[PDB]
Amino acid sequence: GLHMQAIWDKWHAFVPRTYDQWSLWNTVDKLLTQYVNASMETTACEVVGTSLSLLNKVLVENEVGDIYSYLKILGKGVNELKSSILPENLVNLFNCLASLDLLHIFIKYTTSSFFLTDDFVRFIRVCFHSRIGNLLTLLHGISFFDFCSLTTGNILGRIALAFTSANIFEHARLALLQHFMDHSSLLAEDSSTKMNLILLQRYAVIISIFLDQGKCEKANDLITKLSLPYEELAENFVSILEACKAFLVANSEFISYTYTERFIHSLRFLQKMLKNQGMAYIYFASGMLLVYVPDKPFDPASTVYRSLNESIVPLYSELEFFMKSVVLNQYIFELAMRLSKESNIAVVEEAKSFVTKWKAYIERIREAYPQFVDVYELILSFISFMIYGIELLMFEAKRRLDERSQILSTLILTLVDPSSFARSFDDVSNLIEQIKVLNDSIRFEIYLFLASRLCSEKQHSDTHSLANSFVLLANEFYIHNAKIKQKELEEVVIERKRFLQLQFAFWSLYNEIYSEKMNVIPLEQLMNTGSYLAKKIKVKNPDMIASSGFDIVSVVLMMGVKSTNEPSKAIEVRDLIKIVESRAISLIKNWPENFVLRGLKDAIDAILNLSPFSPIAEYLSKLERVFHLLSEWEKLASREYSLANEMDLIKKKIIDWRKFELSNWNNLLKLEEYKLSERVYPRLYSILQFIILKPFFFTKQNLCESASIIVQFITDLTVGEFQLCLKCLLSFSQHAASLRICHGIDAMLLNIYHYFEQFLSKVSEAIHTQKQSLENSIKERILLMSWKDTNVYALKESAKKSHAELFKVLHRYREVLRQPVSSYLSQKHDWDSLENNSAMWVAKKVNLSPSYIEKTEIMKLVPVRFSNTPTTLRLMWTLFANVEKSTFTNMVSNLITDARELMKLTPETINDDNLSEIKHLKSRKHLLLTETFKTLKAFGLQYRVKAGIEENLSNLRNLLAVIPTFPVLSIEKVDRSLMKSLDFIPKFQTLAGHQHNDLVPEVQKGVGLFNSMLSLQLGERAQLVEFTNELLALKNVYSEVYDHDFENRAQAVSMLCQIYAIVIQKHSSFQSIGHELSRFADLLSNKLFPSADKVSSIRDQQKGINDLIEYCRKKRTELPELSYCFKHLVSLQSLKDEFLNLMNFVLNLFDSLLSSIETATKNMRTFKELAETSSFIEMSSCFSKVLRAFNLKFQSMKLSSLKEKLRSSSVDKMSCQLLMLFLPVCEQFINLAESVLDYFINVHNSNLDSLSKISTLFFMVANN
């Protein structure tokens, strides 16, 4: 009931003029719409339709007839195209690119554009492949789909393009990827904000037309249609406010199209923008709608169509009905009210009904009444803005209604995209939490994918992140494992199959994480496996409910390309089979048989049935049945109509296939090996992970847990496992040992390994021996049949014979592995026969010290009183030199030499030497034991002591549990020897009640001296572990001695560099900046790995940071390549006095070190003197006091100077002259520290294993 006149004189589009011109319009429309039904010929037909539009606009200049014949020729061409089709499904992403096309068509062009520029090229190139009269869509020419500003996550279907012949689909998928590369930059500016600028431009047109002669307002329309979208976008708020003010000067009842501008203001200011935009669109829609809605025919009725037919009254009635629904405005307003809030479930149904019903109303308005062409045009354009408003509000509200799907959105955008793989324990907890909130095989598979990314990120050094991540991951896996166990107590079988296999994967990475050989999984393999998990996550979601995250949907389309780029022999075999199957199916479809046709039909029916990559041989069985039926219908008849050449091809293929089964049949020991591990890892997994991973929530507790642990490992008696389990315990040890939510469990695990590490080598020998037996057997058996040169028939029966032989060998291997590992944990009586002090004269290792040793005087005014750091280094080296100077080992060796000499020296016969020599020999043997234990009872080791022996004697498990391990290969030697010693200790204590066979109380005396020896040993071990932890701290202390601590940011930019390098490397004339980019990537990574010549390295590193800021910036500038544009966007986002005090402190520390070394000189020199001048105790405690030369106090003062220097500014002229004058000798102290640690360390190993050999000698004496 309003004006509607001048808009049809100011929008006032182009339209057919003559009745014959309307005939030409509709005829050309019918033709070209047929022509856009259904590669390189697509580009040809694009040129065809382009020139046809050129000629139609030429005829629109009203000189008719040339295109009557010319378009008749083009119609002959289109009809020759009509001899040529197009089935597809879920190709809606083509309609999404079409939407981006129509948006770039409308918004980026303000002038009249009669499809001249390449926007028409991209639009037609989509269009003739797109979904949906095309000239009616062209009908808004000299003038002025939507929800792909909401949810582009329908790209999931694109990866679900490749999932469920399909090679036309696959080259079409490459075509869709090609067109996506074509529509790159306009899809990469921004969606969903450009439509705001579109509403600005449309209302600019309408409100500019709302006046006629406002001069400053005419300049306002001039700048308010200023077709610089960045400049207009900067102008946005100011232009909108000025438009509000100039719109206020209009007539009354404009409050609908005034309050439009309210919501549209903050809509481009606000996540939450969607509802503001939808309200604004519905508002400005109804504003110009009720503006240009009359309650009568107000036509613009030259340049109109030839019609004195005037049922514009009836079409105005039909337009007035859908005006009637919004005429009251209760429903538009009511729908708008529903969009803001309070929508439970009914608003979704009502809104979808409104969208559909008004949509079909617009469609019928298009189809019937082509009359009122200009009228239905402007009206339906406003109504399209309305329905876009109603549905955009519907999508925002339905997202806020049931937010289950947005969980899958935040997972799926962060499961496969560069924004995820940029770079956690909080986020790992969050995504594990949301995964719990998110059939289940994929739900564990994503946990595996996050795990692999965790180990990958692990290389770039911390325990807390990787630790807690892995702990939470294993918590999930253990809960699921016991869930499957209890469910087993009562495709589900296939579900359990994938559960067990991925369980093997998870514990495989768990034994691979901290065993630390080489943990590189390639980042491209990481991302592409992310894509396989992404489309498998697509399989998991049977709904498109998830709504875009709206921060990236551009490169993530290209991740499906590299997934389609970069158990499969079934494909080629089925290809050859399908070729010959269709050949014979046609030749039988034209010459019937009525029996063999059913045969080959069911053959191709079941042959192409399965698509499994684990089932391969069943396809070989299907091909065997096909060759059987083909042999039948070949031998029946038809000397003409047979195919028979691919039959020979199938003969050769089955020949090589059975040959492949013959070769792969050698792989069977690994088969039961992996079956053994798949049954193995869950048990020790659940036990040790329960008692070592409850500790996210003492000494007696550690002892009890060690009792259960050693009970398990010794109870793990099924040989072969012990190699795997020993490796596994070392793994669980370290990869929970870096967790500081337990401390002692590390000691129990590592000692449990390193003293279950005695027995390993003989077990390995027996294992490889039985392996040799079965391998020789299999070599004979697969040698016992060859390329048979016969028997297409008897192939299966010969295979059955080999299957019997393999079954025999499998039972044999199951037996040999199923033997218990209780066997090889012992030792026996075998004669065996068994470094001083290294250094580092590191004056050249500093050597910028020699120059300032020739230079300075400002430092020389200060007296250090050391005064020759050269001669200080000489003094330290000369100290170790003279102090370079074991009797337990030495007397043990003298006794063992006498033992071998006597053992051969009375090796004579029984009766003849029993005449004389047996008496003197046996009595001398007893005298050897007597004087041995006597001089022993002198040499320390007093008998009859049990005050601290009640600890060491019982619970060999818990006695092992006390043994403190060293912090960080001589250490391995020492630990192996004394752990073997303590291994012999428990059974030797338990070895009473059979000594009189060897033939007393002195047996108890020997047992006591043995316990005393092990006690002195273990105390030496405790002091060693103490000095080890102390020097480890001090090495970290000296370890902390312009650009630093932003190296985290450097590492992150390197990570993104490598990621987007793989991305642009998936381009399939663009590879030139591919490898080039990677060059910069590697330099930054090398700098991170490094984190004097290093100052040049960091200078070059920061200069490379500048360069790779610039060498992307030109390529982002001088080339669109919009993936690299987003990457460089994230890159550029990430990118841009007390002299006496510390002097006396430091020289005090230096002299403290020098006197500490001199104290060590006195102490170990006395140890050298009182070496034999002692009895195993005095020199023992003396050496313990020698090691008790002060370290931790020196560690304290070193940390004091570390704090005093780190907080303070570093000056090369004075502060660094002293630091150079000192810190060298600190390095010297660390050097000689590790030297003495090794010297006494190997001394401990020497004396320990020497008396351990003496103890095994005593047990050998106890044998007989």
Description:
With 1264 residues, the protein is mainly α. The chain has six domains: 181 residues, no CATH class; 161 residues, no CATH class; 96 residues; 150 residues, no CATH class; 296 residues, no CATH class; 89 residues. The chain has 55 helices and no strands. Helix 23 crosses helix 32 and helix 45 runs antiparallel to helix 47. The radius of gyration is 44 Å and the shape is globular. One of its GO terms (molecular function) is calcium ion binding. Keywords: ATP-binding, Chaperone, Nucleotide-binding, Nucleus, Phosphoprotein. This is Midasin.
Beta content: under 5%
Large-scale geometry: globular
E-strand count: 0
Largest sheet: none
Q: What is the alpha-carbon Rg in Å?
A: 44 Å
- Give the % helix: over 70%
Structural class: mainly alpha
Please tally the helical runs, counting DSSP H or I stretches of 4 or more residues.
55
In brief:
The PDB classes it as motor protein. The protein is mainly alpha-helical and 1264 residues long.
Features:
monomer, Midasin, 6 domains, 71% helix, mainly alpha, 1264 residues
List the helices and strands and how they pair.
Elements: H1 19-35, H2 40-59, H3 66-83, H4 92-107, H5 118-127, H6 134-137, H7 156-159, H8 166-182, H9 194-209, H10 215-224, H11 229-248, H12 256-267, H13 273-291, H14 312-327, H15 330-340, H16 346-367, H17 373-401, H18 404-413, H19 418-421, H20 425-437, H21 441-458, H22 464-489, H23 492-513, H24 523-540, H25 555-564, H26 569-589, H27 596-607, H28 617-636, H29 645-664, H30 669-693, H31 699-715, H32 721-737, H33 744-754, H34 760-783, H35 795-818, H36 843-846, H37 849-853, H38 857-861, H39 869-882, H40 887-905, H41 911-915, H42 917-938, H43 949-952, H44 956-962, H45 970-989, H46 995-998, H47 1001-1039, H48 1047-1065, H49 1072-1088, H50 1093-1117, H51 1122-1135, H52 1139-1169, H53 1178-1187, H54 1192-1207, H55 1215-1263
Helix pairs in contact: 1-3, 2-3, 2-5, 4-5, 9-10, 9-11, 9-13, 10-11, 11-12, 12-13, 13-15, 13-17, 15-17, 16-17, 20-22, 21-22, 21-23, 21-24, 22-23, 22-30, 23-30, 23-32, 24-25, 26-27, 26-29, 27-28, 28-29, 30-32, 31-33, 31-44, 32-33, 33-44, 34-35, 39-55, 40-55, 45-47, 45-55, 47-54, 47-55, 48-49, ...
